[PDB]
Design a protein around this ligand. Structure first.
Ligand code: WL7
Length: 460
């Protein structure tokens, strides 16, 4: 029974509007409706992993699990195993996997973050799940961010609090937030970003949706514009949106957008918007292909339509050699030449690097770099040829070229990370000096760059 080198992952997000679902929701799991939809010829082919994010979910965990499992069983004739379920208030995440994956899945973690203070603490935040699938780390975040067209900045703040404080993945990766802990990170939910057009244009927007002409609406989508200006979701991907706005519908039809201000909305307009989104971030040069991104047309219990996305994701096997794990493989080494960090910091402390990777027995601390002044004001931390020689646990190129090195640049004075990034070992050549590069972030904001050259020795 060979170990897979690819799996498919289903991501669903649905704001249920506090209403029970209808008797049939199979169209969601089948990626049928509007947008980038899944071919009919695939309908009986189960995805390997289904990750379901709900918001405003009125069901017990038990009630929702029964509906999900019975749905998937009707589609696939497979009884899925529950990997994890975690609920914060009415925000929920369920992970289901094919039974053949039960002994490939380990290190299951769940967590939640509550966003806001006093007034704004009590219903918004995020839930998450992480686990290992053989040699590949997978993270999943379902967030319900702040509502309202005039609160995009609050949403961006909610995003930063979630990525700082959601405690998933390998706790030994202490300098790294969730945006660096996983081979593949999926972040989805009711992100609540709106189409920022004047209220007086509501009927014009509706007209445009009826014509399936989304271009002039997407150009005002706050998530796209905030992402363009690097205000949120830096270094994440999203598939092109080719489905109608998923909010705000009249219930029991999809024929009408309910946008006008009402006591029930706090006298706020809800212009048709793409509130319900799926984004991802994978390590550099790992296979990840979005194969569907759309909304259902036939599930109408909520004022939101369900959104689906599916992905092909590269995975690796749990590698064992005669040597590692449990020792080094002297035939393997990673060297760094001519490396330097460029930091935006106004501070003058010494800096050192930490190299973290599952290809190492434990993380490696460098010597302090040499600070110089850049031409345009910047701090440049020079490591020259001073960086240590990293000793991987396994030298087989079929293993080592699939690995990644996480880098943190830390203050000597405070031992606090000023920036985090990631370098792929999927090189064009071994035993050859080759350029490397990663942006550096801290709390998911750009703080600098790390660049230099790498020389990788494998057993071949
Ligand atoms: C129309 N629907 C069935 C009855 O509602 S469906 O769930 O949207 C659907 C199912 C399978 C395919 N191939 C296409 C659409």
């Amino acid at each position: 029974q060979p170990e897979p080198d690819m799996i498919t992952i289903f991501i669903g997000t649905w704001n249920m509007g506090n209403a029970p679902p209808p008797k049939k929701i199979t169209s969601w799991f089948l990626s049928k409706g509007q947008g980038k939809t899944r071919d009919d010829s695939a309908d009986y082919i189960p995805h390997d992993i289904y990750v379901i994010g709900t918001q405003e979910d009125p069901l017990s965990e038990k009630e929702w699990l029964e509906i999900l499992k019975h749905s998937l069983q009707e589609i696939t004739s497979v009884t899925f195993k529950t990997v994890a379920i975690h609920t914060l208030w009415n925000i929920r995440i369920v992970v289901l996997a094919k039974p053949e994956h039960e002994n490939r899945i380990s290190h299951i973690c769940t967590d939640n973050v509550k966003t806001g203070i006093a007034n704004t603490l009590g219903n918004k935040g995020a839930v998450g799940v992480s686990f290992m699938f053989n040699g590949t780390s997978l993270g999943f975040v379902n967030s319900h961010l702040t509502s309202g067209s005039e609160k995009k900045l609050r949403r961006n703040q909610n995003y930063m609090n979630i990525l700082r404080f959601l405690a998933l993945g390998d706790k030994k990766l202490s300098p790294f937030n969730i945006t660096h802990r996983f081979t593949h990170l999926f972040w989805f939910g009711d992100l609540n970003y709106r189409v920022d057009l004047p209220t007086w244009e509501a009927e014009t927007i509706i007209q445009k949706i009826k014509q399936q002409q989304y271009a002039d609406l997407l150009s005002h989508d706050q998530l796209l514009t905030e992402r363009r200006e690097q205000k949120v979701f830096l270094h994440f991907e999203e598939e092109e949106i080719t489905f109608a706005p998923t909010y705000r519908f009249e219930r029991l039809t999809r024929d009408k957008y309910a946008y006008t201000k009402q006591k029930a909305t706090g006298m706020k307009y809800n212009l048709p918007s793409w509130c319900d989104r799926v984004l991802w971030k994978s390590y550099p040069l790992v296979h990840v292909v979005c194969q569907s991104y759309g909304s259902t047309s036939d599930i109408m219990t909520s004022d939101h339509s369900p959104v689906f996305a599916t992905f092909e994701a590269g995975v690796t096997s749990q590698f064992v050699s005669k040597n590692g794990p449990g020792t080094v493989d002297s035939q393997g080494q990673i060297e760094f030449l001519r490396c330097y960090a460029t930091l935006k910091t106004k501070s003058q402390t010494k800096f050192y690097l930490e190299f973290h990777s599952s290809c190492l027995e434990s993380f490696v601390k460098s010597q302090e770099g040499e600070n110089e002044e850049g031409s345009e004001g910047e701090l440049v931390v020079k490591f020259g040829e001073t960086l240590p020689k990293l000793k991987p646990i396994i030298s087989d190129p079929e293993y080592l070229l699939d690995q990644h090195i996480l880098i943190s640049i830390k203050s000597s004075d405070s031992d606090e990370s000023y920036g985090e990034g990631c370098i792929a070992l999927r090189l064009e050549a071994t035993e050859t000096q080759l350029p490397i590069y990663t942006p550096l972030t801290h709390h998911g904001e750009l703080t600098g760059h790390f660049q230099g050259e790498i020389k990788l020795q494998t057993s071949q």
